Structures are given as C-alpha cells and as structure tokens.
Symmetry: C2
C-alpha cells in the first residue's frame, strides 16, 4: 500500500559534526563554598546543586570570549570533520541563546570569521534550547529542495556573565529566599559550542540521514524560564511538570509520523537540563536509561548546543553504528517540544 | 524553481502613537553640536528624518508585534486557530530566552500544533521569515503562517541622548550615536497561506540573497549598493527581473542618502519607491512590511502589479524577493 512521506525530510544528511568543551572548570564545590553563608541564612542544608540538580561541575570561557568566537571554533572543527572547505557552504545558521549584539546577526560574524562566499545565506534563529533542531530543519528544507549543497548550523554559548552576576546577587546579605530560588538554575548552566555540516545525501552517501520530525507547543507557559545576558529566572517545578505534559503530547505525534516506539530506538539524545528532568523524562516514557547519554554532571546545561554536543560526543566515543536509530529531542522554554530522528 | 503555491492572505502595520520631532531632539543636542563645531543638522537636513514615533512607556516588542498580528488576522479573515507557524523577525526582543515569538503566540492563544521561533538578521529578517514560512507552506507542513515584527526604540532615545551630550564625547562617537537617533518604533504582521486556500490573494514567488560578510555608515552605503547590484544580477537570472518591469520597489528605510543612492544606481523611477523614514525614521526589519501594508491600505497596488521586496542589511546582506499582487 502506497504511503506518504509524512513530510519527513528526504535526502538530507549529516556530513560533519563537532563540539568544543570550554577550558575552565568551575566545580559545584567551589560555588557552594561561596554560597555557604547564604545557604546558612536560608536554612538550606542539602546540596541543591550537586545532589538535587545533579551538577558537579561546569565549564567556562575567559571573560572576553564571545558567542561568535566559540561558534567559529566549532564550525572550523565541523568543516574538518566533513572534509570540505568553507567555500562549499551555501547557508549558515546560528542558533545560540548567547548573542554578540542586537545586530548584526551572530551568524554574520561567524560567517565573516570563516570567510564564506558571497552566495552564502546567513541569519540567526532563536528558540531557547531547541533552536539547533530548528536550524537543522530550516537547512533541511533547502537541502531537500536542492537549493544548496551544504549548510552549517552553529551554536556557541557563553555563561560567564550570568555566573558572575548571579553569584554576586545570590551572595547578597539581603537576597530573599524567593529570588535565590528564582535564580538558582542559572548556576546549572554551562559554556560550550557545537557545529554541524548538513548536505544533500547524494554528496555523502554513507553519512547519517536526518529525517526531521514533530513539534508541539504550550506557549501559555512562556514565562516559566526567562533569561538575559546576565540573569536567568526559572520556575523549576512547573518547567518540569508542564515540560513532561507537553512531551507526552509530542510523543503521540512522533508515534504517528515517525512510527516511534521507544524499544526500537537505539539512542535518545535529549535536552540536558538536570538530573530530575532527565529522570522524569526517562521514567515517563519508559526509556532504557542506558540509551540516554548525559553530560549535565560535568558540563551543566549548554542550552541549544546541548543536543548536538551530546551527539558529537556519542560519535567521538564510538557509541554510534550504521543503522542506529537516534532520537533527538528536547523541551525548551516556550514551552516547545521537538522530536526528530537521525539514522546513523 | 520559484514558489508556486504560496500567497499573502493578510497584512497589517501599527503606527506608534507618540511623535518625537527632530527639531525637538535638536534643541537638546544644540550645546553639544556647538561644542564640537558641527553646524550641520544631520538628522533633518542630511538624513532627511524629521520625526519618528515612540510607543507608550513599557510597551515591549512582543506587545507591538501582538497588536500587528491581531490586525493582520482580521485582514486575512481567519481565526488564530488556523495559524501553524509564527515567526518573529524583530531586532527588538523581550529576552534572550524564550523567543519573542512564543510570547506573542501566548498573547494570541495559538494552538498546541503551532510552531514558533525568532529569526534575527538586522533589517532583512522579515524577508528571511517570509522565505522560511514559504518553504513550510509549500511542503504542506502548515496552511497558514504569521510573520510578525515589533520594534521598540524608547530606551535607545533616553540612553543615547544622555550619553552623547556628556563631557568628552568625541566627534566620532557623537556621529555614530546620531545614527541611533534615526530609529523609529512601529510594527507589522503578515499572514501567509497555501494558495489553494486563498485564490486571488497576492502570490509570493521567493527571491535571492547575496552577502558580503567580510564587511563585518558612509561605507554601509557604497558597499551595500555594490552588494545590491550583485544581488540584482542574480535576481535577473532567477526572477526574470528587469528594473522597468517592476511596479513597486519596497525597500529598507534608512535615510534620504541611502534611498537616493539606491534609486540612482539602478536607474529606478523614484515614484515607484515609497519612503516613510521622513515621518517614521528607520523601523529596522519592520520597514519593508510596513511600507507594503501602507501601499495596500492606500490603494496603490493593483492586481498583477510586480512588486520587489528588498533590503540591504547589516552583515552585510542583501535579499530581494518578488510578490505578484
């Protein structure tokens, strides 16, 4: 019986993938030492970072590293992984939450750094921690159509400033319990970068395929997590609960359009938000935890770069083999939930 | 191949309510002009910007984009429940996270199927957003899309005026900051749709982009125009473009010198280039759709009119697209 493609992407591949780990380690132990007087004043006796959130360390850049710098570093690495020159790139999309300026785009700055040709289309996409997937989808539609041969999706996150200013606010003798709780999740963020080269499958016959997938939203929850360059406020409780509710809705759609059943997927590359988020997600959908790599523990939450960083790390570790069915998914501020598939 | 089944179902713009005249601004800058020995009225006489609009205090980009979106929905005569994609393309943004799109969408009450995100690309983003939406519409992923753009500049004026009139500011800094005093507030939204749903609606054909990211305001001019020429050459090949066959050019709204340079370089009839920066200043990526909406509202657009949407944006980037009314 002839069936439709369910609008999944055809002939779109992943030609190259790379990640950058930021150089300076900041441990939760050091952070707690700094916060201890405030903990004591608030009567907080558990390690809310290392034991509850499950984050033991995260990485930071130097103060003077911009989103675009980190993104550029990842891009050059991904180009090498794809064994192609920048002159072949017809589209470059930057998907980071971190941003150099209001304008021009961070993508234009990265493109300038790399030396893209005058045919290269560039722009930023912003959608909290799901934007890398959005950028992949945007690139995929052009590649499928045959408009371009290769695309770069890039993402550099700088959390230095938010750490600096949050730690200052959270150690004020005047800080309230409410503001402390509001800003706590900022201390689970991490720096890092990722880049991906995507291509028409014709050019890279043995490369992984990207099929795309599905999205559902609950934009009535757009206030749950709000962040600027120096401050992030989060309702962690509702983020968790409403996130899981939305994911259940998305999974139903995934089953319909992707044919997903959890036992048949080989890897789940998921949003890296916290141990409790991960535990709840895995438990909600009856996922085998062995199929869910996490990096939150030593890198924290790297926003929209998290997913591709985890994928790149799976690649470098030799965890992925030809034929493996890889679920890429995330819940991001919005609220939004996207689920997509890669066949290695 | 150009897009064959992508149409414009609805279009609206919002003019911001408060006028700040350049004469009013100038009275505040006079002492500083004198100090630097300038003498020239850069805003009024050079840039040709005599006024711009400002929102009420505490209007956010999302608020302005929401007002426009509601008006565009009415223009399209559809309910919010029909929207499957909402893209926000504004330079102004409420936060880094979440997207300004999600906030506008929460204000409108979009459905749980509605995909949203922001696109940022200086003054070109609306055209980028249209193109992204067109691709989804064409593939049958959605039936209707909103592309929205709300720009706020209130804070810019307060901050910049104070800063530029402070002691020790150089002629260099002062002139750079004058540029900020050409920015205006405003909003626009467009409903795009699959054509079989809206026969007789204008059709979006798509377009071309060229970039000069090596260039990353007097230079913005010449280099931008050079980039535009390159882009127009490409446009000729994908769109069948010839200057004399286009009925309107809807362009980035930056200044008189930018506009005159563009018109002269391409040998365009200035009557085919509506401008609004005289009264509204530079509204960033909202400028193009605001001008298109004003042309529509004013009865300037006729069935079969061939319309060039184009912008020269920071990057440098240049994008051109065609709408057939």
């Amino acid at each position: 019986v002839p069936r439709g493609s369910h609008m999944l992407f055809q002939n779109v591949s992943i030609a190259g993938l790379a990640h950058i780990d930021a150089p300076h380690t900041l441990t939760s132990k050091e952070i707690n030492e700094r916060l201890q007087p405030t903990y004591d004043r608030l009567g907080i006796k558990t390690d809310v970072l290392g034991d509850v959130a499950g984050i033991h360390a995260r990485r930071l850049w130097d103060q003077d590293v911009q989103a675009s710098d980190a993104a550029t570093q990842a891009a050059r690495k991904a180009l090498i992984d794809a064994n192609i020159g920048i002159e072949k790139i017809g589209l470059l999309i930057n998907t980071s939450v971190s941003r150099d300026y209001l304008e021009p785009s961070t993508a234009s700055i990265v493109s300038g750094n790399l030396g893209v040709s005058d045919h290269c289309m560039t722009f930023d996409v912003a959608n909290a921690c799901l934007a890398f997937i959005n950028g992949m989808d945007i690139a995929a539609r052009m590649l499928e159509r045959g408009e371009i041969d290769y695309a770069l999706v890039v993402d550099g996150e700088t959390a230095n400033l938010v750490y600096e200013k949050t730690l200052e606010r959270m150690t004020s003798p005047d800080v309230t319990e409410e503001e402390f709780r509001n800003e706590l999740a900022a201390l689970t963020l991490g720096c890092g970068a990722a880049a991906m080269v995507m291509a028409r499958s014709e050019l890279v016959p043995d490369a992984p395929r990207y099929k795309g997938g599905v999205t559902r939203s609950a934009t009535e929850w757009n206030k749950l997590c709000r962040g600027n360059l120096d401050r992030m406020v989060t309702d962690t409780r509702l983020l968790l609960i409403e996130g899981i509710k939305l994911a259940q809705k998305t999974f139903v759609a995934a089953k319909q359009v992707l044919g997903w059943a959890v036992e048949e997927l080989d890897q789940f590359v998921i949003h890296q938000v916290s141990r409790p988020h991960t535990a709840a997600f895995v438990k909600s959908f009856g996922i085998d935890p062995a199929k869910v790599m996490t990096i939150f523990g030593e890198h924290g939450n790297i926003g929209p770069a998290s997913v591709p960083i985890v994928l790149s790390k799976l690649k470098e570790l030799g965890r992925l083999k030809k034929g493996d069915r890889i679920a890429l998914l995330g819940i991001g501020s919005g609220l939004n939930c996207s689920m997509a598939e890669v066949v290695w």
